Design a protein around this nucleic acid. Structure first.
Lengths: 187, 77, 141, 110, 59
RNA sequence: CUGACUGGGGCCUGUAGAGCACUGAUAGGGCUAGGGGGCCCACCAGCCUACCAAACCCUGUCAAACUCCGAAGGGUCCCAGGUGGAGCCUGGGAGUGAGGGCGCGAGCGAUAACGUCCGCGUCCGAGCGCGGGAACAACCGAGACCGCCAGCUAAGGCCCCCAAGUCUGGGCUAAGUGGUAAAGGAUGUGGCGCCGCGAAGACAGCCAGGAGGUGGCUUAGAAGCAGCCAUCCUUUAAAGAGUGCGUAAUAGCUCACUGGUCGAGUGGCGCCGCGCCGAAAAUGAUCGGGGCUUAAGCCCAGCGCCGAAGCUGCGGGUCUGGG
RNA sequence: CGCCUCCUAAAAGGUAACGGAGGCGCCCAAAGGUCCCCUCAGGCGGGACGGAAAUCCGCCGGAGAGCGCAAGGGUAGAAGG
RNA sequence: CGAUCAACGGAUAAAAGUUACCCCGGGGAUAACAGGCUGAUCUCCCCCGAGCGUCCACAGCGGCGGGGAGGUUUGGCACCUCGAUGUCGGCUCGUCGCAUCCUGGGGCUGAAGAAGGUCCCAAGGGUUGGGCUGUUCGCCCAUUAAAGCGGCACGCGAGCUG
RNA sequence: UCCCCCGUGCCCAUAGCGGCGUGGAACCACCCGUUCCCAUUCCGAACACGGAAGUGAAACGCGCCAGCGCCGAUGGUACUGGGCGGGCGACCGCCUGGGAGAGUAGGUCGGUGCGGGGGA
């Protein structure tokens, strides 16, 4: 949903300061524009968990601009698993690519039997309209068993959607569970 | 405990000997190489062992031609 | 246990361990993980001990995800031999793990089960670790 | 991707570019023969002869002789005497050899 | 511009290239000052041993 | 004038890093050869396999002897700066050719060694001359020509030993931590941020009740406290056929739950600072000692002061170069 | 114990260890020169014996083939046949 | 042109061992002892708790792994000492640490009592005699409250033995 | 002085791959024959000569398309020269300068010189 976050133009400030100053250095750009910026760390985190890449995020620039944007990418402190720079894609018109969540309706019959269910790609890749972004994509993951798998070709789509991956790309599989019963062999 | 390893041949001292923008007389070794990491070009000869050297006098001119490999040139004075 | 089925070079040099985890640093497959916190090696015995510990604590279902592998041949010489006269033998295969390395991804499990399981596995391992969750930070990576 | 035609072409022309003397490129169409002098250092065609321009006829070998002498004349008017002949992808024979004779006897050095 | 440059820390134990950079500026003892024209070469030597020396742009 | 070094410019490189385009290694999937199983089976094929398992594709990783890439740098050369116990050449004389420590980058080693072996650098060696570090060759400062009962600083200090502040402001610690060690644990403490409920009243202290058939799979005859196949609602605060004591039997307790009495925080998380345990070796102990707790500790901010053979001041000597 | 290749080896070269890997102590009268001609491996489909893999055909291929022998470098616009 | 002059810059054209019968010059440039640094090995201690323990992870236990301490073993290095630091064992004499064998105190218990197990605090005192063996060590004998483990140059030869 | 074609070259994929349409005036090519020149480890496939029946099918040329490919920012970071510290150690921070690779946006279905022939 619409997730607003104040955006400030970092001019010449050192990124270590802003990251030190609770500010997340980022940069917002498109084929038209490009601007060094920064945000609040805690703000971008709070929204961003709500506002995962799957969703528009309106940056409230200081001038009054309210940018429909998309987190194209985010840098992370590997040594801390902490965001360290944000890639703000200015979601203008002329429909663009992104990742949409997956609404896996139902539970696999095999998973109910005791198997384990793994979501291969918990998000999907689609070049869709800037203002026609379906927040979810449901799937029938109930008619499965241990060893059954789904692919990109079986997902049905809302209007104006373009699956941007291999149609044969498997995304959900039911593998045999993890059991101590097969450990006495290993004990 | 014994060892199979422990031997190594002598250092051959390969590499480029004169650089671009460097005056050279004819007959000077330009590149002491194996194979042709640099190919001979304008006023540049190459002996049997791929050794590039100045054909004429002048200045060294390295020039990479992309897919066409790295060439050397001896631009006369 | 885990060990390369073959390799171009039997022995290998020790090598520095400084720096951050290059690859495998976001929850990719499972729901929870156990990221490293200090650089260190992890032998196949330790990886295996943590694995069997996790599967036992689960004891049913769930899926374990070992995003590391012990390829580097660990080496020690025969006991009470003077230095030199060759390199020691391959005691076993370790796996280098820098900080940020997401060692373990468990999925198909309730939160508490994966949490405690990853905790026990953490105790089995020789490094301070951190249980974590798949996130948009993970989803964005 | 190449052909034995193409690979032959770059073959002979690399060989002749190697020397440094002016090159005598000789295209040979089915109905015409084109020949020119070229300075690889400059990529500039010095002298241009072409069976098409002379409007010749008869045996193609005949026209190769004629255009050979014509290019010999146009070049010798420019003082260019030593020049490397480029048979290109062609075999040095028939029409092309007729042209080469048209230049050697035409007063050209090669 | 010119450069009052006061050698304000011993170069002993530092790399010989640094010391030679000090000689390039002619500095020989502690507390030795030299006003020198700010040339990019001389400024280069100053930058090399800036940690060993104090600098003030005088003129 | 060419030196070291420096700036400009030119180019050379495959390292760190990164990456998987090569070689390998590789986790899990899709796919699926092919081999394995079951039938169908020999009349030869066909299904199923949650078997292994090519090749390939997806996601995710590794590599000193992998590289689609690729630095920082370093090398060289031209130009410029650079007059120096600089440089070059020619000769005479050498000693040295057991090195070591420290830092960094590596190998070996056990990612042990005051270890070994290399590269770059430094110091000692030869500077065990000087200040600090208590003591200590290489750790910090700094290159000892000499004298002076002069001054300014370096590191390091300014509670006494011992010179300089019981100096100033802001905090934290209560362990003498400081002034020894790890994982692990911990209502330690201080500061944070995060969420719950907070007067259609909290935690909390209490107070009062808190279930029925009774059976299911009925079976070590306990419907409920027992190995579990279960979990209809019912009784007008509604309290679950229970968490646990008696129950191969009832009990009775108590909890969740019903509200009230009190009436304001309370409840749970994550982060950080400093602390605790973890923490046992052998002649007498100790932070160098004394002692030290809004410190005389730790962190932050200052100012001032001490502080060397450093520097400056005076005088003197001596060597090179110039007059 | 001598020489070659690669890493070690820190993007110049050189660089140690009873460090990590392999080689050489030849061979070719053509495996040399030169001119001319051609371009591989591999994969798929078709093809009597005959196959996984003989020879043939078509199709896709920059080189992953080959280049006397270790490795590496080089290389088809040939050093390959 | 005659080289495994391959110890491959090739000491002769031409050459192997042994010495506890030894000797000389040197070396702590280098070994055995000890000491020293490391703690691989070792002793001990904690972490996880799989599983056991009618059941019950933790009375007792503690798979697989992890983290430590000590510096008594075997080791590594070779740092002092090779113009000398005498090396196992026994005896005499001790002194010290506690990681306590008994004696003291206590906790928990799968502690009915008694007897125990385990852990905690505790070093004041004690920790026997003998057979075998050079032995330390160990086994055994009879006991004991027990029959501790270690450091002190594996203490101690200008104290003894050999 | 502009368009087209044919030869060359340079830049070395933004230049390629793939698909799409398109060219016959001319050029080129395909193509027609093989007596000649020449040739096939067989073959006029190739090369070579004579030639012009037909065709742009192919090829080649040009224009479209980003599916692949390739190029690829900006920021940020790894890393690092240098100066500092911290850490028992593995190793880690900070100041100054440098600064990736990956990825992201985005871009590319080429540009360029020379000489000929044709046309305007």
């Amino acid at each position: 949903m619409e997730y607003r976050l104040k955006a400030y133009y970092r001019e010449g400030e050192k990124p270590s300061a802003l990251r030190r100053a609770g500010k997340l250095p980022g940069v917002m750009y498109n084929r038209h524009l490009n601007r060094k910026v920064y945000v609040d760390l805690v703000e971008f985190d709070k929204v961003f968990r709500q506002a995962s890449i799957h969703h528009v995020i309106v940056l409230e620039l200081p001038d009054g601009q309210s940018l429909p944007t998309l987190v194209r990418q985010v840098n992370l402190d590997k040594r801390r698993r902490r965001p360290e720079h944000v890639d703000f894609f200015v979601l203008s018109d002329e429909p663009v690519e992104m990742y949409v969540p997956l609404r896996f309706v139902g539970t696999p019959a095999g998973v109910r039997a005791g198997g384990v269910l793994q979501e291969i790609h918990r998000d999907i890749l689609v070049k869709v309209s800037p203002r026609n972004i379906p927040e979810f994509i449901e799937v029938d993951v109930s008619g499965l068993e241990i060893g059954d798998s789904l692919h990109a070709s079986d997902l049905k789509l809302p209007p104006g959607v373009e699956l941007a991956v291999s149609p044969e790309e498997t995304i959900a599989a039911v593998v045999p569970p993890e059991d101590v019963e097969k450990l006495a062999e290993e004990a | 405990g014994s060892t199979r390893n422990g031997r190594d041949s002598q250092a051959k001292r390969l590499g480029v000997k004169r650089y671009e923008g460097q005056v050279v007389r004819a007959g000077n070794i330009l590149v002491r190489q194996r194979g042709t990491r640099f190919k001979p070009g304008k006023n540049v000869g190459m002996g049997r062992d791929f050794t590039l050297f100045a054909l004429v006098d002048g200045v060294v001119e390295f020039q990479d031609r992309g897919r066409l490999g790295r060439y050397v040139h001896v631009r006369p004075l | 246990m885990l060990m390369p089925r073959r390799m171009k070079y039997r022995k290998q040099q020790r090598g520095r361990l400084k720096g951050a985890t290059k690859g495998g640093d976001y929850v990719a497959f499972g729901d929870y993980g156990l990221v490293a916190l200090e650089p260190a090696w992890i032998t196949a015995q330790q990886i295996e001990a943590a694995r069997v510990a996790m599967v036992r604590h689960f004891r049913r279902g769930g899926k374990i995800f070992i995003r590391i592998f012990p390829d580097k041949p660990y080496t020690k010489k025969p006991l009470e031999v003077r230095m030199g006269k060759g390199k020691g033998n391959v005691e076993g295969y370790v796996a280098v793990v820098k900080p940020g390395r997401v060692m373990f991804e468990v999925a198909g499990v309730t939160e508490e089960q994966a949490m405690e399981a990853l905790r026990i596995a953490g105790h089995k391992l020789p490094i301070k670790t951190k249980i974590v969750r798949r996130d948009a930070y993970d989803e964005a990576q | 991707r190449l052909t034995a035609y193409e690979r032959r072409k770059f073959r002979v022309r690399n060989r002749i570019k190697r020397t440094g003397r002016l090159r005598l490129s000789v295209f040979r169409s089915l109905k015409h023969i084109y020949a020119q002098i070229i300075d690889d250092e400059k990529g500039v065609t010095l002298v241009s002869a072409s069976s098409l321009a002379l409007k010749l006829k008869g045996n193609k070998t005949e026209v190769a002789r004629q255009v050979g002498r014509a290019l010999a004349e146009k070049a010798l008017a420019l003082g260019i005497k030593q020049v490397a002949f480029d048979r290109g992808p062609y075999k040095y024979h028939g029409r092309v050899k007729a042209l080469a004779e048209g230049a050697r006897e035409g007063g050209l050095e090669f | 511009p010119r450069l009052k440059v006061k050698l304000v820390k011993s170069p002993i134990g530092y790399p010989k290239d640094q010391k030679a950079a000090l000689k390039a500026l002619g500095l020989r003892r502690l507390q030795q000052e030299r006003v020198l024209e700010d040339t990019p070469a001389i400024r280069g030597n100053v930058e090399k041993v800036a940690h060993l020396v104090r600098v003030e742009v005088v003129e």
